[model samples]
Target: MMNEKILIVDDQYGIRILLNEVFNKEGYQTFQAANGLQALDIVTKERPDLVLLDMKIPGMDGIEILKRMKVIDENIRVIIMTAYGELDMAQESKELGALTHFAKPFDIDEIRDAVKKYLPLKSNLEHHHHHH
Candidate 1:
């Protein structure tokens, strides 16, 4: 069974809902936060294995949230999202230990693959074999 936890932090309700649905379907225990305060709280209580963070969140931006999260759990893994081609912000996040960054309107499949790459599900059965 897969029990890895994932936290999603984005100010946009749609983004949070979309990611919640996606990761839930993938069998992850997912949590959502609309701002840094909520995010930090989850990090303290839930200690999610990974986080999908948005860079332009209101009140507390992604960079600050990332830094605070690192302080809480230095081993925490993060994948950041930027609205446009904000290379500088992306670089800063990477420097702060984010696994990667995706631009807005990012391909859902790409994000899915990145999450799998970072946090592979633990299952005893290989259930998705293809019979050709």
Candidate 2:
């Protein structure tokens, strides 16, 4: 997945920064949006290969934003973020075609694995695979 683009949509500065760094290091061109409107703007303009979305946010929230993103591009890949009580919204997201959901305080290894499942190959994980 050479020159792949990823958009991270979260209200938390730390979440956005962390995900941006993680994906950038893996060779993706990353963008961050702190709210639904900004997320939709990025989705319309950039058409990122994947989006890491947070369910809790001011204004539109994740599910509506995801639906809007689908309108912008039906094939857009989205991996949503959900907290313990937000499983209902998480299920809603899945029904609307999200790639998957990641719980808060994310597990980096899980993120990496899910990303690989939803996206094209990023690196030579020959080293990682042999161990697995």
**Top of the candidates by lDDT:** 1
- Candidate 2: misplaced stretches above 4 Å? 83-97, 105-107, 120-132
How does candidate 1 fare on TM-score?
Answer: 0.69
lDDT of 1 by residue, 50-129 (tens): 77777677766776677666666666776677543434654465446455676663656776787766563455322454
Provide the global lDDT of candidate 1 against the true structure: 0.66
Identify the leading candidate in terms of TM-score: 1
Tens digit of per-residue lDDT, candidate 2, span 1-132: 555777777777576667667776564656778776777787778777677677576555766677666667666776677443334654465546355666674665676676777664546432365433
Clashing pairs in 1: none
Report the Cα lDDT for residue 122, model 1: 50
Candidate 2: worst-modelled 10 consecutive residues by lDDT: 123-132
Question: What is the C-alpha local distance difference test score of each model?
Answer: 0.66, 0.65
Q: Candidate 2: deviation at residue 36, Å?
A: 2.0
Q: In candidate 1, residue 38 scores what lDDT?
A: 79
